[PDB]
């Protein structure tokens, strides 16, 4: 299925995923396609910080959903 990732500078990245992909897999796909190391990625959806070990279906992320991507240089 198709999901979208929006950045703070207003750009949209499209990903091909399955509901059983983990957030870790998604960050790895962003890194594959955009070079951003997963540790610098924060994905946000529906008022939640998303956690690497859970699945898209765990957050009811469906076809056509749009995640927010925030980059960080350190922890928090
Ligand atoms: Mg959405």
Swiss-Prot record:
Residues found modified as Phosphoserine: 65
Documented effect of changing residue 65 to A: Prevents phosphorylation in case of mitophagy. Decreased localization of PRKN to mitochondria
Subcellular location: Cytoplasm; Nucleus; Mitochondrion outer membrane
Residues found modified as (Microbial infection) ADP-ribosylthreonine: 66
Post-translational modification: Phosphorylated at Ser-65 by PINK1 during mitophagy. Phosphorylated ubiquitin specifically binds and activates parkin (PRKN), triggering mitophagy. Phosphorylation does not affect E1-mediated E2 charging of ubiquitin but affects discharging of E2 enzymes to form polyubiquitin chains. It also affects deubiquitination by deubiquitinase enzymes such as USP30. Mono-ADP-ribosylated at the C-terminus by PARP9, a component of the PPAR9-DTX3L complex. ADP-ribosylation requires processing by E1 and E2 enzymes and prevents ubiquitin conjugation to substrates such as histones.
Cross-link Glycyl lysine isopeptide (Lys-Gly) (interchain with G-Cter in ubiquitin): where in chain: 6, 11, 27, 29, 33, 48, 63
List of residues that carry ADP-ribosylglycine: 76
Cross-link (Glycyl lysine isopeptide (Gly-Lys) (interchain with K-? in acceptor proteins)): 76
Annotated consequence of substituting residue 72 to K: No effect on ADP-ribosylation
UniProt name for this protein: Ubiquitin
Location of this fragment in the whole protein: 1 to 76 of 229
